[PDB]
Design an enzyme around this catalytic site. Structure first.
Site, PDB file in Angstrom:
ATOM      1  NE  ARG D 350      -0.354  -1.234   5.381  1.00 45.79           N
ATOM      2  CZ  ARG D 350      -1.480  -1.026   4.712  1.00 45.79           C
ATOM      3  NH1 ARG D 350      -2.626  -1.098   5.389  1.00 45.79           N
ATOM      4  NH2 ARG D 350      -1.441  -0.759   3.410  1.00 45.79           N
TER       5      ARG D 350
HETATM    6  N1  LIG Z   1      -0.789   9.612   9.991  1.00 43.39           N
HETATM    7  C1  LIG Z   1       0.212   8.761   9.724  1.00 43.39           C
HETATM    8  N2  LIG Z   1       1.394   8.933  10.332  1.00 43.39           N
HETATM    9  C2  LIG Z   1       2.430   8.086  10.047  1.00 43.39           C
HETATM   10  N3  LIG Z   1       2.431   7.043   9.253  1.00 43.39           N
HETATM   11  C3  LIG Z   1       1.220   6.880   8.668  1.00 43.39           C
HETATM   12  C4  LIG Z   1       0.100   7.663   8.846  1.00 43.39           C
HETATM   13  N4  LIG Z   1      -0.935   7.205   8.056  1.00 43.39           N
HETATM   14  C5  LIG Z   1      -0.417   6.176   7.406  1.00 43.39           C
HETATM   15  N5  LIG Z   1       0.871   5.933   7.731  1.00 43.39           N
HETATM   16  C6  LIG Z   1       1.748   4.821   7.296  1.00 43.39           C
HETATM   17  O1  LIG Z   1       1.055   4.145   6.255  1.00 43.39           O
HETATM   18  C7  LIG Z   1       0.719   2.776   6.649  1.00 43.39           C
HETATM   19  C8  LIG Z   1      -0.600   2.379   5.977  1.00 43.39           C
HETATM   20  O2  LIG Z   1      -1.651   3.304   6.413  1.00 43.39           O
HETATM   21  P1  LIG Z   1      -3.213   3.001   6.313  1.00 43.39           P
HETATM   22  O3  LIG Z   1      -4.100   4.010   6.779  1.00 43.39           O
HETATM   23  O4  LIG Z   1      -3.440   1.704   7.100  1.00 43.39           O
HETATM   24  O5  LIG Z   1      -3.391   2.690   4.744  1.00 43.39           O
HETATM   25  P2  LIG Z   1      -4.742   2.744   3.881  1.00 43.39           P
HETATM   26  O6  LIG Z   1      -4.841   4.074   3.165  1.00 43.39           O
HETATM   27  O7  LIG Z   1      -4.485   1.666   2.895  1.00 43.39           O
HETATM   28  O8  LIG Z   1      -5.856   2.546   4.788  1.00 43.39           O
HETATM   29  C9  LIG Z   1       0.646   2.918   8.176  1.00 43.39           C
HETATM   30  O9  LIG Z   1       0.757   1.651   8.798  1.00 43.39           O
HETATM   31  C10 LIG Z   1       1.883   3.792   8.434  1.00 43.39           C
HETATM   32  O10 LIG Z   1       3.099   3.068   8.393  1.00 43.39           O
HETATM   33  F1  ALF Z   2      -4.352  -1.058   3.077  1.00 45.52           F
HETATM   34 AL1  ALF Z   2      -5.430   0.025   2.163  1.00 45.52          AL
HETATM   35  F2  ALF Z   2      -6.527   1.037   1.154  1.00 45.52           F
HETATM   36  F3  ALF Z   2      -6.634   0.014   3.460  1.00 45.52           F
HETATM   37  F4  ALF Z   2      -4.247   0.021   0.796  1.00 45.52           F
HETATM   38 MG   LIG Z   3      -6.919   0.857   5.182  1.00 40.97          MG
END
Ligand SMILES: Nc1ncnc2c1ncn2[C@@H]1O[C@H](COP(=O)(O)OP(=O)(O)O)[C@@H](O)[C@H]1O
Ligand code: ALF
Ligand SMILES: [Mg+2]
Ligand SMILES: Nc1ncnc2c1ncn2[C@@H]1O[C@H](COP(=O)(O)OP(=O)(O)O)[C@@H](O)[C@H]1O
Ligand SMILES: Nc1ncnc2c1ncn2[C@@H]1O[C@H](COP(=O)(O)OP(=O)(O)O)[C@@H](O)[C@H]1O
Ligand SMILES: [Mg+2]
Ligand SMILES: [Mg+2]
Lengths: 54, 466, 157, 479, 454, 128, 128
Positions: D350
């Site tokens: 990330r």
């Molecule tokens: N809209 C998107 N387009 C492309 N990759 C995405 C997108 N959303 C998430 N990802 C991939 O998933 C990783 C984790 O997303 P994130 O939103 O930070 O996770 P969480 O649901 O845990 O908050 C991102 O860093 C990216 O590599």
């Molecule tokens: F990194 Al997350 F829910 F924010 F898995």
């Molecule tokens: Mg998150």
């Protein structure tokens, strides 16, 4: 020409079907072990929770 | 009045008072500490003893240590002087910029707005994200929940919403970081300073930051959402003006509650959770609301444990929402981003008398074709599409194109997609799905509808593919 | 579940009902492969009754074991014998349904009572192939077998 | 003296209940007469509950207990380098006392928002597949996850071996001190690892903290916090440390044992409700400090063992939700000879793209796109070309153990592949091709390599130069 | 000191002492009984009372009954005198041949060799399929898998029988949950084949039984008793010993039952919360020290056939190799019923076993996984659509299948046929050929149930 | 009040799933030990005593009535789960709605085979 | 009595599943600790000491014998449930019956590819 095209197609088709199936067997098998484990754990936590609450 | 600690177990501290017991919810202050240590009264145990929950670590506490009753619940700075600042759970500055000199203070606990204060106005909030606007559109002043398993895209989706809605929003915003990564709090702060949304020199900042991340003990993660929402209430009311409230991630409130529920002496409920899961959730969620006095458009990321949407936490949260965007790992693994499940995302505003009959008929047609396809998949699982019947062959090809046209490159994800971001206007999102459903692109390859903006971009990409 | 699992040992006959059978509109919703009786013995009810009942169970169990290959490789891939197992089992499934007098508020059909000899005969005739020409829906919700032969005529317009 | 000392009331189920200790602090280390240490966990009106950091059969009712006056802490410093210690910091390698001069609390809260900056310096593993496609930066948390025997530990060990080039160099800012925390592993395995590190001459810059499979659960629970504090010592003093937690699955099992013995309510898989926080507070302490706090860092590579590739289970998902991405390993990939067994499409960094050298950047980009296109197709010349490049690129990502590669060599190798110099080759000959070419550029073209290393990029000249070398190598390539 | 029983609840006994309490893990002897009744201290409850787990039945016990503290954990006889004898968990002779007159005794609880106190080798079994395809390495732990009645125990017996050579040939067999009928049969076979000599001191195996009908504390501790017998040989007399644990699942379940009896809350899937440290404290003692080594073969029951169940899952972290038997193979007539395509080694590679051995093995898996493909077509389309090439892979393969079969000395009581012990040399050789065809004319019988290629 | 005074009333309980959850909180906090799914062992009785009060009275009692439509929320379509079957086991029928039909355009989304009325045509005009 | 006096006895225990239920009732009501399915930690030993009493005596002891045929009732085919796993592991073999075989006409409903007898041929006559 049709028989060769027929048999070539049937092979390829049963091939995919056979690969799809093995994939279905993996999801199901893994579904099965996880569910079996969670049922025993869950039933036991309900027993202990009721026991300790007395 | 002063008391003495009689017991300490992690975040739970018992305190005995010889004179005057502090009422439930009062903030008590532990004496003899280098940094302020608040204890929030949770119960009266009997024998002049109360049971409390600490807002910071309890290492170094001794039995007999003195405690004073502040005479009220946790109170924090509210008002224009919170804008551009970073505060923690008890309202202290955690940005090294000195005191927060407001005129006003507000308790972090408060009764929710009553039934007579409810507003019934419903109006669309366009995000420029095709799958959301078409199928389960957001409402101004409404409650929006973003459900998702670990790493499926909730924060990325929040940041895109900030970028498409907020940055160019009339009023103020409050971002409450709850049980997430401190480094994400450092990322956000720096990006807002770089864009000017936060200004360290003027009084022009437009956002107030509130943080209590995954490095904090449970009492702080269980109350930090109340601190954030309290700041938002003031702007809602005490100015009557339209605030945006982002919370990432509200599941962490309920998780922190389950860590202390054990120390509090309760018999556990299903899945080890606190028996009070739903009424604790309700007393907090009912304050996150638009009232006749002013509007709050809240967006809450909602973690989903072990990817189980039936876990009591995510499952009880559904009732608190006006729009739900459900993300799915399976969809993310197919490379479809945003990884929104188009048959599990809903909106109370998806009614033809509100979004008009054309938006409504296209959204219902997209859902029907995607469910028809899902249903065929189940029967093709083994034997592929050959055995399928040409007309069903047409449900498949169309549904597959629609699924890809729901994908979209986000401005904040360019590093992962290697595609510039796109914002698609509402009328164009409707036209494009209307056309696909009408058969206007049955001759284009699937791949062309993947990762683009408007429908003209699919057509181009089709030519390029030749 | 412990309550019903512990009740089985106290009975001489059991009738087990099933939501999966009810859902198809087959009433009474009796699972024919999980309903038992202490007197289902050739020396008690006679060898004809006994043999027909076991042949009804066998064809219903053989059909149940094929359902998930039919659904995946199609009926054409089935042997001809397997095809007869199918059409006959599906007819026997419907012939086990019956309009009850106390259930007329629910079925819209007059209730029927079928004597033991007529029951034995109807099922023996289906197993033997005497009605391979009648459509399935003819055996659904009737009493005696003559009623299915007449429904087949009715349906044929 | 019941203020400074106490007497054991009861012991069993791992908790010692103690009468007295009226002045003990919550979370203070206490000492049993036998010499074992414990932590004051519960302060009650009529007892203190103590977690024992060792075997409780050495404790009996009536035994004397004494305060230490100090919140649980461990020795820290450069003295720990090259040593093997237990979770309390005592030497277990037989080489004598640790000459430590400073101690640090095992439970210190991680740095807040202000002292940090986004990661921006490369944490080079020496493993082609990671350094190119899942780049790790200094300060980052990158999970290593996959089933048993997929090569999780090996990625860690190669990473540690890789740092010798920097640590034996001039530029102090490029140095990287290593900490390997063994949790619930076999003794013989830890001993084998220390010999391997010793033979590679990597031990001189590594600390090994060990709480193996027969150590009591509380030591296994503690070990990671101990190693972390040893790493923080570098983080806060303008230096950079790398910590591996091998592994956190076993640490959560040791914690579940302690919790169940304490009768805390079991949840999913019978884990306590604070098992996420167990890990979250630990991994938050890996961070990158801005220059006003000295510019140091602590990088973490936690390990998680899945069961049948299920990354949706409770512990895996918990840890995925804490780290800055993850490197997923798969058994199918391993068996097929895809080693290291990294699933590229599902893995993610990330925050590490900002910390990858431009040079690697100018070649990993196209390899990423080319593998992205391949992943779709695995007749028709076009999709057929994609197939070709994809098969060659996959061969390039294969790598043996114990030979972590310098970044400029990785680029030189990836270059051959994305620029087409491998297409007219037998899939079967890429590996032999790659070794022969590397010995060549290494012997006859150091300067060019020294260039790429120094500039951190491939200039217009280095590109023309490299085009010639590769070209003239492919001609003479006999295989 | 002497204490008094204050509570009896099945197999848990609480004992009170006026002076000096016996530490946790100490052995207490109950007074006034016809046979020895040992209680192992498990906890200190407070008020001078200890909670203990009984090693035999507790019927007849009275509150007030006297109990002596042995001043140490359970101690057992160790030394050459244990060879050819049968012992129980508390070290008493159960073979009826009188006292076990060793010169020493050892505690069954012991810490593992320290970090400083500890390469790779190979242990020749004389069993072609194992020595060829998945050979054992001295000092490691080998899991032995197989459905009920497939031959696991018989295989354990042949291994004990063959080991009587090179590195010495001493063995310890620990029967955890031993079925009494089978403990009689194993004894009689050991005597019959000579590994146990009732006449002299040449016995090469010591037997330790924790029988099914014993209480949970006896079944949980018998593996340790067996382990203690072996540690003597490794440590005091510098040997490479073999430790047989049949079955390790019942070590785990006996521990899960003791935990439940002590009122501890069960963990995932009902196992004890201490599952991993229980396994850990036992296994870690099985290792190579400078003084010598202990190799262990552990029969492992797999619950519901789920390898992700906690018990096998925890056990696997300690294994270096496996031997997988199969019913489908046993039913088609091949013994030992080993599946040549599912056994492995954390260490079987040319660097170790040496090109030769390696190549012979690996050449056999390709033929087998190649013959497996052709099976459908042979059965369906007929064993004729095969090309002259493929047709060749089949006869070679079928020939290799049976060359993997072997008549066991200990199997003579069954088949009536003679047993054979096959040297790595004679094994590696015979398998190298097949490919060649030196036996194409040679029929598939001079290959079935034979020893050496010749 | 309507039922007993010659009148007719319709009550909607939206929903009983959330009511059982509030009852489980109160009970656990009163320290009554939980039963299945952590609900109090009489979660059926909670709803059966309530739903029994919907009734049709005879003429001597004034001929009024009370009709009830309780609501239960299932999870992932599992209609045969414990709480859901408890309520089905109380009412004179159920209307089961399914998501797959809802998105297919089958709205009201009624699963015919799984829905029943236990009064049947006795509650319909002859024309219906 | 027959075993020890040079005679042969056959005992059938129909069934042991019910015996374990009765023991569990007593254990839980005396407040001993509940394990999996609420059985106590010594339920394995309850059956193991019962079944190790079956045996074949040597000539010195009279040549007599006691054969046991315990019966276990499974639920929905689960042979890996607690009490079944225990009695399978204790015995010398098992005869597995299956409802699908039974209604197909395979009666007795024995799964001979899965049933076990470790004694096997040693207990058969030469012609059989
Ligand atoms: N809209 C998107 N387009 C492309 N990759 C995405 C997108 N959303 C998430 N990802 C991939 O998933 C990783 C984790 O997303 P994130 O939103 O930070 O996770 P969480 O649901 O845990 O908050 C991102 O860093 C990216 O590599
Ligand atoms: F990194 Al997350 F829910 F924010 F898995
Ligand atoms: Mg998150
Ligand atoms: N790149 C590689 N090439 C060859 N063998 C490898 C490689 N990486 C790991 N292995 C081997 O695979 C086995 C499993 O590796 P290991 O790192 O211990 O996996 P894990 O830690 O996931 O259990 C070890 O013997 C290791 O030497
Ligand atoms: N090698 C063998 N040769 C002949 N018969 C065998 C062999 N192994 C097992 N058997 C037969 O199978 C029975 C059960 O073997 P056993 O070792 O007890 O199985 P397990 O331990 O796997 O349950 C033996 O009593 C014998 O009848
Ligand atoms: Mg490892
Ligand atoms: Mg055996």
């Amino acid at each position: 020409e049709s028989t060769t095209s027929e048999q070539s197609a049937r092979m390829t088709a049963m091939d995919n079907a056979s690969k799809n199936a093995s994939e279905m067997i993996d999801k199901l098998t893994l579904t099965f072990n996880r569910t079996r484990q969670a049922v025993i754990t869950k039933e036991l936590i309900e027993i202990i929770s009721g026991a300790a609450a007395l | 009045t002063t008391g003495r600690i009689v017991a300490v177990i992690g975040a739970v501290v018992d305190v005995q008072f010889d004179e005057g017991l502090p009422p439930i919810l009062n903030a008590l202050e532990v004496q003899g500490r280098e940094t302020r240590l608040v204890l929030e009264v949770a119960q009266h145990l009997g024998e002049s003893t109360v049971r409390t929950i600490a807002m910071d670590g309890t290492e170094g506490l001794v039995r007999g240590q003195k405690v004073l009753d502040s005479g009220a619940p946790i109170r924090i700075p509210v008002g224009p002087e919170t804008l551009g600042r970073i505060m923690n759970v008890i309202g202290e500055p955690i940005d090294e910029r000195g005191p927060i000199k407001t005129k006003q203070f507000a308790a972090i606990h408060a009764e929710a707005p009553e039934f007579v204060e409810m507003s019934v106005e419903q109006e669309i909030l366009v995000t420029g994200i095709k799958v959301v606007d078409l199928l389960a559109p957001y409402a101004k002043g409404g409650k929006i929940g973003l459900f998702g398993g670990a790493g499926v895209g909730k924060t990325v989706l929040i940041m895109e919403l900030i970028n498409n809605v907020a940055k160019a929003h009339g009023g103020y915003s409050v971002f409450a970081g709850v049980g997430e990564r401190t480094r994400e709090g450092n990322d956000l702060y720096h990006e807002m300073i770089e864009s000017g949304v936060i200004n360290l020199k003027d009084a022009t900042s437009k956002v107030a930051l509130v943080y209590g991340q995954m490095n904090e003990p449970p009492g702080a993660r269980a109350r930090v959402a109340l601190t954030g929402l309290t700041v938002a209430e003031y702007f809602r009311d005490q100015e009557g003006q339209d605030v945006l409230l982002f919370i990432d991630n509200i599941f962490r409130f309920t998780q922190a509650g389950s860590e202390v529920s054990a120390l509090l002496g309760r018999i556990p409920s299903a899945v080890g959770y606190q028996p009070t899961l739903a009424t604790d959730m309700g007393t907090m969620q009912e304050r996150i609301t638009t009232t006749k006095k002013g509007s709050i458009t809240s967006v809450q990321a909602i973690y989903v444990p072990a990817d189980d949407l039936t876990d009591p936490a995510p499952a009880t949260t559904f009732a608190h929402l006006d729009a739900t965007t459900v993300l799915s790992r399976a969809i993310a693994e197919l490379g479809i981003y945003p990884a929104v499940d188009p048959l599990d995302s809903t909106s109370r505003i998806m009614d033809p008398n509100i979004v008009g009959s054309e938006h409504y008929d296209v959204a219902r047609g997209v859902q029907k074709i995607l469910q028809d396809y899902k249903s065929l998949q189940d029967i093709i699982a083994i034997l592929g599409m050959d055995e399928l019947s040409e007309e069903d062959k047409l449900t498949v090809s169309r549904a597959r194109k629609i699924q890809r046209f729901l994908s979209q490159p986000f401005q904040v994800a360019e590093v992962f997609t290697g595609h510039l971001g796109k914002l698609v206007p509402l009328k164009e999102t409707i036209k494009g799905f209307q056309q696909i459903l009408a058969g206007e692109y049955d001759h284009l390859p699937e791949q062309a509808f993947y990762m683009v903006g408007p429908i003209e971009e699919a057509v181009a990409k089709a030519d390029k593919l030749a | 579940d412990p309550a019903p699992a512990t009740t089985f040992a106290h009975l001489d006959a059991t009738t087990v009902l099933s939501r999966a059978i009810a859902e198809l509109g087959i009433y009474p919703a009796v699972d024919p492969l999980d309903s038992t009786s202490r007197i289902m013995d050739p020396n008690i009810v006679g060898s004809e009754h006994y043999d027909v009942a076991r042949g009804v169970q066998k064809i219903l169990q053989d059909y149940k074991s094929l359902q998930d290959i039919i659904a995946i490789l199609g009926m054409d891939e089935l042997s001809e014998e397997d095809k007869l197992t199918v059409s006959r089992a599906r007819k026997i499934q419907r012939f086990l349904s019956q309009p009850f007098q106390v259930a007329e508020v629910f079925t819209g059909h007059l209730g029927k009572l079928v004597p033991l000899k007529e029951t034995i005969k109807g099922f023996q005739q289906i197993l033997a192939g005497e009605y391979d020409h009648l459509p399935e829906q003819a055996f659904y919700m009737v009493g005696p077998i003559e009623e299915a032969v007449a429904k087949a005529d009715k349906l044929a317009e | 003296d019941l203020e400074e000392t106490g007497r054991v009331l009861s012991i069993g189920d791992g908790i010692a209940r103690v009468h007295g200790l009226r002045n003990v602090q919550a979370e203070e280390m206490v000492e049993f007469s036998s010499g074992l240490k414990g932590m004051s966990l519960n302060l009650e009106p009529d007892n203190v509950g103590v977690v024992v950091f060792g075997n409780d059969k050495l404790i009996k009712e009536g035994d004397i207990v004494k305060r230490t006056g100090a919140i649980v802490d461990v020795p820290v410093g450069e003295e720990l380098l090259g040593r093997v210690v237990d979770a309390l910091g005592n030497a277990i390698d037989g080489k004598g006392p640790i000459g430590s001069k400073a101690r640090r609390r095992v439970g210190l809260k991680a740095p807040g928002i202000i002292p940090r900056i986004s990661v921006r310096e490369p944490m080079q593993t020496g493993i082609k597949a990671v350094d190119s496609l899942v780049p790790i930066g200094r300060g980052q948390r990158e999970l290593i996850i996959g089933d048993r025997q997929t090569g999780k530990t090996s990625i860690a060990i190669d990473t540690i071996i890789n740092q010798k080039r920097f640590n034996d160099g001039t530029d102090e800012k490029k140095k990287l001190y290593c900490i390997y925390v063994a949790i619930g592993q076999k003794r013989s395995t830890v001993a084998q690892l220390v010999k391997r590190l010793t033979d590679a001459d990597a031990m001189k810059y590594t600390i090994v903290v060990s709480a193996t499979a027969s150590d009591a659960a509380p030591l296994q629970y503690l070990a990671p916090y101990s190693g972390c504090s040893m790493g923080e010592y570098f983080r806060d003093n303008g230096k950079h440390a790398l910590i591996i937690y091998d592994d956190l699955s076993k640490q959560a099992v040791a914690y579940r044992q302690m919790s169940l013995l304490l009768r805390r309510p079991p949840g999913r898989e019978a884990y306590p409700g604070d098992v996420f926080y167990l890990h979250s507070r630990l991994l938050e302490r890996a961070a990158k400090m801005n220059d006003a706090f000295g510019g140091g860092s602590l990088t973490a590579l936690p390990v998680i063992e899945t069961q049948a590739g299920d990354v949706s289970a409770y512990i895996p998902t918990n840890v995925i939700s804490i780290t800055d991405g993850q490197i997923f390993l798969e058994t199918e990939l391993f068996y097929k000879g895809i080693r290291p067994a990294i699933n590229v499409g599902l893995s993610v960094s990330r925050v590490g793209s900002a910390a990858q050298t431009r040079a690697m950047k100018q070649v990993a980009g196209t390899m990423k796109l080319e593998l992205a296109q391949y992943r779709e197709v695995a007749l028709d010349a076009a999709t057929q070309q994609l197939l070709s490049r994809g098969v060659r690129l996959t061969e390039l990502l294969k790598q043996g153990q114990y030979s972590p590669m310098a970044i400029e060599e990785q680029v030189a190798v990836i270059y051959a592949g994305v620029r087409g110099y491998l297409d007219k080759l037998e899939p079967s000959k890429i590996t032999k091709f790659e070794n022969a070419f590397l010995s060549h550029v290494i012997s006859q073209h150091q300067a060019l390599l020294g260039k790429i290393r120094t500039d951190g990029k491939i200039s217009e000249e280095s590109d023309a130069k490299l085009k010639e070398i590769v070209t003239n190598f492919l001609a003479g390539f006999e295989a």
